[PDB]
Amino acid sequence: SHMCDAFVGTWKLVSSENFDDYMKEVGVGFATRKVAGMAKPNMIISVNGDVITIKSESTFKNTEISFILGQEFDEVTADDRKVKSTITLDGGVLVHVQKWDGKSTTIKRKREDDKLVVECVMKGVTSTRVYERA
Numbered sequence: 001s002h003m004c005d006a007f008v009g010t011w012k013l014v015s016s017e018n019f020d021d022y023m024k025e026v027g028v029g030f031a032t033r034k035v036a037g038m039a040k041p042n043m044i045i046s047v048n049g050d051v052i053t054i055k056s057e058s059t060f061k062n063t064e065i066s067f068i069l070g071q072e073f074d075e076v077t078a079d080d081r082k083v084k085s086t087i088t089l090d091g092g093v094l095v096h097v098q099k100w101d102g103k104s105t106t107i108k109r110k111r112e113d114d115k116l117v118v119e120c121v122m123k124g125v126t127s128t129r130v131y132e133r134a
């Protein structure tokens with residue numbers, strides 16, 4: 001109850017740093033990187049009971065995940081990886097781990113001031129994506 005209150009809402013991407021390099025490290029191909037990197041998605045976060053839903057709506061590829069914290073699920077990513085995901089809350093940060101093909105990437109979502117800051121890590125490469133309220 002009230003676990004993700006400050007995440008709930010509709011958010012719009014306003015800045016990105018190092019996302020191309022993050023995608024390269026993940027293994028995303030050229031054409032997907034170029035088109036995906038243009039997108040300015042809206043991220044829509046909602047909670048109903050124990051179920052959290054995160055939607056991403058963009059000109060590249062709409063996605064939607066629903067999950068319970070700590071409970072692994074199947075996810076098809078925007079770049080079409082078939083991953084096994086687990087999302088937990090760690091000290092007020094949503095921590096999303098994706099596993100596929102013996103690889104792993106972690107996406108952290110945090111509230112900072114009036115922004116939602118998304119940090120994506122693959123090995124030594126980090127990308128920071130900043131969202132504001134839509």
Ligand SMILES: O=C(O)CCn1nnc(-c2cc(Cl)cc(Cl)c2)n1
Nearest residue numbers: 023026028036078079107118120129
């Ligand atoms: O939500 C955000 O801004 C960042 C979290 N995030 N959402 N989508 C992706 C993504 C998309 C593509 Cl096409 C490739 C790869 Cl490796 C990751 N990462």
